[PDB]
Design an enzyme around this catalytic site. Structure first.
Site, short mmCIF file in Angstrom:
data_model
loop_
_atom_site.label_atom_id
_atom_site.label_comp_id
_atom_site.label_asym_id
_atom_site.label_seq_id
_atom_site.Cartn_x
_atom_site.Cartn_y
_atom_site.Cartn_z
CB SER A 79 -0.93 -0.17 1.20
OG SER A 79 -2.04 0.71 1.09
CE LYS A 235 -3.71 -3.97 5.45
NZ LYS A 235 -2.61 -3.03 5.26
#
EC number: 4.1.2.47
Length: 256
Positions: A79, A235
């Protein structure tokens, strides 16, 4: 082959998001370092002490400085972690065998350091129940944020278990994108960051770094290799831990 992987979390997170991936990589024979960046995880600093993404990156820069001559690592950033990779690559590119971006921002060398972040905020403008605050550091006003629990549930940990989402509510801390600081930062260099091998890993099921943003980044700054993981969520080191370790074994076998 075996590699030394350095796993780099995103803003508001810590080493703990890698708790499933790190034992899997070690069971393949790899050395793994999972860092807590400044004011992250169980690091002693608070975010109001941090004035830039470069200061935020100090544990990664200190780690790379401590590597003996000739030891190379594969950086793995999730990210916002791609920005820590770019900062690190402009100081220690000789020590970086390759960089793996994991549903990650991909800075470039032709536009300002905030460029890809400015584009993310256009594609994903509503961070739902995320709260914001401001603090002053080195004469600049920085916007801090604390990720909202509904944003965490629906957009970041979409398909993760309730016990994984529970860790995120318990452990996510105040952070910052340092967006206005990145906008005035000197550009990432072609000779440092531009020279490293870049492997871009993503899923089109990511609910915050949406396909338009990730396919936009791939077109903006062409990766050396792209891996697309089917299914999972933002994730992937939690929902597709095995598949990420398989991709990282291939990178270890390709880049040294």
């Amino acid at each position: 082959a075996f590699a030394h992987f350095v796993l780099i979390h995103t803003i508001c997170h810590g080493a703990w998001i890698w708790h499933k991936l790190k034992p899997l990589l070690e069971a393949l024979g790899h050395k793994v370092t999972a860092l807590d960046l400044a004011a992250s995880g169980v690091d002693p600093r608070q975010i109001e002490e941090i004035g830039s993404f470069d200061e935020y990156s100090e544990p990664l820069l200190t780690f790379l400085e401590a590597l003996p001559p000739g030891e190379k690592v594969i950086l793995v950033g999730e990210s916002c972690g791609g920005l820590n990779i770019a900062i690190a690559a402009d100081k220690y590119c000789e020590k970086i065998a390759a960089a793996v971006f994991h549903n990650s921002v991909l800075p470039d060398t032709e536009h300002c350091p905030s460029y890809v972040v400015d584009k993310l905020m256009e594609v994903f403008p509503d961070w739902k129940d995320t709260t914001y605050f401001t603090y002053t550091k080195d004469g600049k006003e920085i916007t801090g944020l604390k990720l909202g629990f509904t944003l965490l549930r629906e957009n970041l940990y979409t398909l993760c278990g309730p016990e994984e989402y529970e860790l995120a509510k318990m452990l996510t801390r105040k952070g910052s994108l340092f967006q206005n600081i990145l906008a005035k930062r000197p550009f990432f260099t072609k000779e440092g960051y531009g020279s490293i091998k870049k492997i871009y890993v993503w899923t089109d099921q990511d609910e915050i770094f949406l396909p338009e943003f990730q396919l936009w980044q791939i077109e903006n700054y062409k990766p050396d290799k792209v891996y697309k993981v089917e299914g999972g969520d933002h994730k992937l080191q939690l929902t597709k831990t095995k598949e990420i370790a398989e991709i990282l074994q291939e990178v270890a076998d390709t880049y040294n």
